[PDB]
């Protein structure tokens, strides 16, 4: 698999998934919420099309 990109507790906690702990930068359409990497690749949001929120930004 993959160890991860950010693995430090001193990291800017921004919309961190309370389930996995990964930063939520994606936006699921089917659900209309913000999910993380693991989530997206999870049977929960599997196949679901998500978009990069990039914080306070429309496009
Ligand atoms: Zn998650
Ligand atoms: Zn979804």
From Swiss-Prot:
Source taxon at top rank: Eukaryota
Subcellular location: Cytoplasm; Nucleus
Post-translational modification: Degraded in a proteasome-independent fashion in the absence of viral infection but in a proteasome-dependent fashion following exposure to restriction sensitive virus. Autoubiquitinated in a RING finger- and UBE2D2-dependent manner. Monoubiquitinated by TRIM21. Deubiquitinated by Yersinia YopJ. Ubiquitination may not lead to proteasomal degradation.
Modified residues (Phosphoserine): 8
Binding site for Zn(2+): 17, 20, 39, 45
Residue intervals of every B box-type zinc finger in the record: 12-53
Ranges that cross the membrane: none
Function (record text): Capsid-specific restriction factor that prevents infection from non-host-adapted retroviruses. Blocks viral replication early in the life cycle, after viral entry but before reverse transcription. In addition to acting as a capsid-specific restriction factor, also acts as a pattern recognition receptor that activates innate immune signaling in response to the retroviral capsid lattice.
Family as reported in the entry's similarity comment: Belongs to the TRIM/RBCC family.
Free-text comment on this protein's domains from its UniProt entry: The B box-type zinc finger domain and the coiled-coil domain contribute to the higher and low order multimerization respectively which is essential for restriction activity. The coiled coil domain is important for higher order multimerization by promoting the initial dimerization.
Oligomer status and interactors: Can form homodimers and homotrimers. In addition to lower-order dimerization, also exhibits a higher-order multimerization and both low- and high-order multimerizations are essential for its restriction activity. Isoform Delta interacts with BTBD1 and BTBD2. Interacts with PSMC4, PSMC5, PSMD7 and HSPA8/HSC70. Interacts (via B30.2/SPRY domain) with HSPA1A/B. Interacts with PSMC2, MAP3K7/TAK1, TAB2 and TAB3. Interacts with SQSTM1. Interacts with TRIM6 and TRIM34. Interacts with ULK1 (phosphorylated form), GABARAP, GABARAPL1, GABARAPL2, MAP1LC3A, MAP1LC3C and BECN1.
Name of the molecule in the record: Tripartite motif-containing protein 5
Species annotation: Homo sapiens (Human)
Higher taxonomy: Eukaryota, Metazoa, Chordata, Craniata, Vertebrata
Gene that specifies this protein: TRIM5
């Amino acid at each position: 698999g993959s160890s991860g990109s950010s693995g430090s507790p001193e990291g800017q906690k921004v919309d961190h998934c309370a389930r996995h702990g990964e930063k939520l930068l994606l936006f699921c359409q089917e659900d209309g919420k913000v999910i993380c990497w693991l989530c997206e690749r999870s049977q929960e949001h599997r196949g679901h099309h998500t978009f990069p929120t990039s914080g306070p930004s429309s496009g």
